[PDB]
Amino acid sequence: HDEEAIKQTLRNKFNYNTRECQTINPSIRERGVSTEPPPSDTICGNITQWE
Amino acid sequence: TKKARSVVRDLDPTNDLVFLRIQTKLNEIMVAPDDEFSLIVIQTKG
Numbered sequence: 001h002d003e004e005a006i007k008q009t010l011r012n013k014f015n016y017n018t019r020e021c022q023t024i025n026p027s028i029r030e031r032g033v034s035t036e037p038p039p040s041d042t043i044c045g046n047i048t049q050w051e
Numbered sequence: 052t053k054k055a056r057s058v059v060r061d062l063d064p065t066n067d068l069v070f071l072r073i074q075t076k077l078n079e080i081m082v083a084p085d086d087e088f089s090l091i092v093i094q095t096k097g
Binding site: 049050 | 057060061064
């Protein structure tokens, strides 16, 4: 057996185990929100003693 | 007349306009005011 083969032979399924791990990520989303204050109206009031 | 009625009205609330007469330099204007109708007569000063 060659030294390179022995190095490959040294690694074993029980000897080396590979596991793939990922972190859950929420999908990116784009949303547009517009806010506009309540409508305002002009009011004119005249008060007199008789009224 | 409506503006004039309020002027009379401000001094005394109970008092209501009965008759209003405005005399100009060349003419005399007389207005009689009632809720239902208003009578206006223009008479040249003698």
